[PDB]
């Protein structure tokens, strides 16, 4: 219950730090450090989430096979939507690094705003998807 959501909160904190567009995050965006750090954070989040889901399934009662299969599939589909949005965020951060490499070192002051709006919409949809993942987990604790 708590551990995977605590990992998700650490991921949120890192996402806020990267969407502040500080000069530290602007020099780490070109060293690919933020990309792999975000990757490790969301990987820990996903591992905790799937561990919680596997424990919930492990303590599933006198369940019919098809219903258990469908519930597990619901949780897995929620998690994989989260993974899809996460991977899109990661790939677009890499693309932003390689397309500020298009002038080889310097970035403008408006491509930052465009990237920032993209990151804000990504954060909102990530919150929505993570909370429906938690909802699917709650639904799993039944039957």
């Amino acid at each position: 219950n708590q551990p995977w959501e605590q990992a998700l909160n650490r991921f949120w904190d890192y996402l806020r730090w990267v969407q502040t567009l500080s000069d530290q995050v602007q020099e780490e965006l070109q060293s690919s450090q933020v990309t792999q750090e975000l990757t490790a954070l969301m990987e820990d989040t996903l591992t905790e989430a799937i561990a919680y889901m596997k424990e919930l399934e492990e303590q599933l009662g006198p369940v019919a096979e098809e219903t258990r299969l469908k519930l597990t599939q619901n949780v897995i589909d929620a998690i994989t939507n989260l993974v899809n949005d996460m991977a899109e965020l990661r790939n677009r951060l890499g693309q932003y690094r390689n397309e500020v490499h298009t002038m080889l070192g310097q970035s403008t002051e408006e491509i930052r705003a465009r990237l920032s709006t993209h990151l804000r919409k990504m954060r909102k949809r990530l919150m929505r998807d993570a909370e429906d993942v938690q909802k699917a987990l709650a639904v799993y604790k039944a039957g």
Partner: antibody
């Protein structure tokens, strides 16, 4: 219109290892189980193993467990099979196939084009 | 190779033919059987799952059945396009893994 696309053909010497990849184009296959099935020239299908990464399950066939390693990168929507200690007996065609659900019981309804692996001295 | 199929099966156009698939108490006795079709030089295609279900693209000329330790595929209205190899597959708990049959080479006379 999700499609599994595999890496190109491989020609190896006995004793080396091979790594075949399987990329999902037009969609994600993370919520499904991807299994690797090999077919020797003129022989039948042979299950090597499989992986569903979101469910966190990598299973191997008992024949290949000591040699094969199956993994997946979920952020690039790719699966990988690495076969070690290649001999002449391993020349075959390797397909990656996607099951109907997150586990390996269901039928494999989406198939890649296959990777030809030729091991010869 | 825990499942057994007849290696060769023939039939005239229009005829109805069957492919048998006998297993054990650990692969077909407790798990469902799938049927795949493979043409020369191409990837296999899922033809039957859960012993009797057809994918939407598979015509109703193909049917499946399962009885205890055995399974059976039935191809009615045999056409020349059906010359292929047919594999039955299941999950073996004794082996803890997927098992296939030897493959049946369906040839059409004429």
């Amino acid at each position: 219109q999700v499609q599994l696309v595999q890496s190109g053909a491989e020609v190896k010497k006995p004793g080396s290892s091979v790594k075949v990849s399987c990329k999902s184009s037009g969609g994600t296959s993370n919520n499904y189980a991807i299994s690797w099935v090999r077919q020797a020239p003129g022989q039948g299908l042979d299950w090597m193993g499989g992986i569903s990464p979101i469910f966190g399950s990598t299973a191997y066939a008992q024949k290949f467990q000591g040699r094969v390693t199956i993994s997946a990168d979920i952020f690039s929507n790719t699966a990988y099979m690495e076969l070690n200690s290649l001999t002449s007996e391993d020349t075959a065609v390797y397909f990656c196939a996607r099951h109907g659900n997150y586990y390996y019981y269901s039928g494999m309804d989406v198939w890649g084009q296959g990777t030809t692996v030729t091991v010869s001295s | 190779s825990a499942l057994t199929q007849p290696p060769a099966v023939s039939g005239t156009p229009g005829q109805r033919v069957t492919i048998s698939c006998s297993g054990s108490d650990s692969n077909i006795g407790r798990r469902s059987v799938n049927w795949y079709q493979q043409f020369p030089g191409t990837a296999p295609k899922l033809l039957i799952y859960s012993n009797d279900q057809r994918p939407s693209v598979v015509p109703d000329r193909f049917s499946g059945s399962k009885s205890g330790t055995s399974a059976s595929l039935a191809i009615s209205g045999l056409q020349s396009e059906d010359e292929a190899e047919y594999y039955c597959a299941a999950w073996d708990d004794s082996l803890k893994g997927a098992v296939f049959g030897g493959g049946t080479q369906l040839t059409v006379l004429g």
